[PDB]
Design a protein around this ligand. Structure first.
Ligand code: HEM
Length: 152
């Protein structure tokens, strides 16, 4: 449950991401994969990436980063009214990709890390609070769908 002012902060922060969705998406995934190498194993199409240099050079990783952040941005712009947008992602990530909710926590924190890394001094405490709450809401609603599906 975010207030109007918190959603305003989220969407203000998101404008930073939308200015360079592929660069943000790439760095989010690289942060996830390097911070939590087990997550790489969930991607048949990225498990060949042995080094961060290879990840950085991967155009397909940037492409997927764009897909991920485009989806997330579409969800965030719903300001919590995202049941229709979230449902297929929860279902695909539970049933097809088999992504534990822990990895969604990892990527949530990776987003925060990337925002500070790319916008040092420009991702204020209020913005971090609001973005964190929005990612928690996202993760929590996914978690509810995971529970429905019995997925761990
Ligand atoms: C912000 C969180 C995330 C969003 C918005 C997101 C979004 C997406 C989207 C839109 C797709 C393609 C459509 C689909 O299959 O449903 C996708 C595919 C996938 N996602 Fe995610 N995802 C997220 C987090 C994760 C995490 C944390 C993992 C694994 C650690 C993961 C693993 C995958 C895999 C394995 C695929 C299929 C990739 C392929 O083979 O093309 N996702 N994701």
């Amino acid at each position: 449950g975010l207030s109007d002012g918190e959603w305003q902060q989220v969407l203000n922060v998101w404008g930073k991401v939308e200015a360079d969705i592929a660069g943000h998406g790439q760095e989010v995934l690289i942060r996830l994969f390097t911070g939590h190498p087990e997550t790489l194993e969930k991607f048949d199409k990225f498990k060949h990436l042995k080094t961060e240099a290879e990840m950085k050079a991967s155009e397909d990783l940037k492409k997927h980063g764009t897909v991920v952040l485009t989806a997330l941005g579409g969800i965030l712009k719903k300001k919590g009214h995202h049941e229709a947008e979230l449902k297929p992602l929860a279902q695909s990530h539970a049933t097809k990709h088999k992504i534990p909710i822990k990895y969604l926590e990892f990527i949530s924190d990776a987003i925060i890390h990337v925002l500070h890394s790319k916008h040092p001094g420009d991702f204020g405490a209020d913005a971090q609070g609001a973005m964190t709450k929005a990612l928690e809401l996202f993760r929590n609603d996914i978690a509810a769908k995971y529970k429905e599906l019995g997925f761990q």
